[PDB]
Design a protein around this ligand. Structure first.
Ligand SMILES: Nc1ncnc2c1ncn2[C@@H]1O[C@H](COP(=O)(O)OP(=O)(O)NP(=O)(O)O)[C@@H](O)[C@H]1O
Ligand SMILES: [Mg+2]
Length: 251
């Protein structure tokens, strides 16, 4: 059974892409066959895994449009994950998708052609709530929200949760919000903890554990950040294998 995880948050700079790549690497180390999907036209994930987006002959853009088969667009990574990459062409997608029926289901249709080739698909959503993020949420079974806890600024969480609810009502009833993954956690004071407690208090959003400390990127070594990503990846594995609920930062 292929697990599809979307990593989404319309707020920019909260470590979505670092989280996709680092969870992907951790799961690959544990033996899972991993596909990463870059849905950001700026191509941060693609660049971070060693592919110049501007030089890709095709990308996920042609795949979403149905003009190129998904397998033909896949590229390799040094750590063994497979990548469905993106480049700036993808910014034109919604102009072309809006003119077509079922624009929300383009990525879902593409992944259906790859089912059984991968144990886990992780989708890197751009900092927006438009057609590309909707495609990510519509194709996924689970979603996590990387949530920065350097500052108290979280006015966008409400609209993000509304977006999840809308997707569950219209395009993907089975989507499960696993919760928020704390990122950019600062160990110098209790401020980051207090930020996370504030979010857990005010929003119907599980805050998951462990936080990823502040040290796009790919944390795969013996650092505290890599250690935390591997611990979180283990939690995902247990949840998918035994139904174990994801551990929470605060109950
Ligand atoms: N644990 C970390 N410690 C320090 N810097 C980090 C960490 N995680 C991410 N960063 C940096 O924070 C910045 C934003 O990370 P990134 O993974 O690109 O977030 P993002 O949510 O994908 N940005 P965007 O797609 O534009 O919304 C990058 O410069 C990363 O290298
Ligand atoms: Mg990103």
């Amino acid at each position: 059974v292929t697990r599809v995880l979307a990593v989404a948050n319309q707020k920019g700079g909260v470590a979505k892409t670092t989280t996709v790549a680092s969870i992907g690497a951790a799961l690959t180390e544990q033996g899972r066959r991993v596909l990463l999907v870059d849905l950001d036209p700026q191509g941060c994930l693609t660049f971070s895994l060693g592919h110049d987006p501007d030089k890709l002959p095709v990308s996920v853009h042609e795949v979403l449009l149905g003009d190129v088969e998904p397998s033909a667009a896949l590229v390799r990574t040094d750590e063994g994950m497979t990548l469905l990459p993106a480049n700036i062409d993808l910014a034109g997608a919604e102009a072309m998708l809006l003119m077509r029926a079922g624009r929300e289901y383009a990525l879902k249709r593409a992944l259906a052609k790859l089912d059984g080739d991968f144990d886990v698909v992780i989708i890197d959503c751009p900092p927006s709530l438009g057609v590309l993020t909707l495609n990510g949420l519509t194709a996924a079974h689970d979603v996590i929200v990387p949530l920065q806890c350097e500052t108290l600024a979280h006015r966008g969480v409400g609209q993000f949760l509304r977006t999840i609810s809308d997707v569950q009502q219209i395009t993907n009833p089975d989507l499960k919000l696993l919760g928020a993954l704390p990122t950019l956690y600062d160990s110098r004071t209790t401020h980051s903890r207090d930020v996370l407690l504030d979010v857990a208090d005010r929003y119907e959003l599980p805050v998951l554990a462990p936080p990823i400390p502040r040290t796009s990127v790919l944390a795969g070594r013996k650092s505290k950040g890599a250690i935390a990503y591997r611990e979180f990846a283990d939690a995902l594995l247990r949840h998918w294998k035994s139904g174990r609920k994801m551990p929470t930062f605060t109950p």
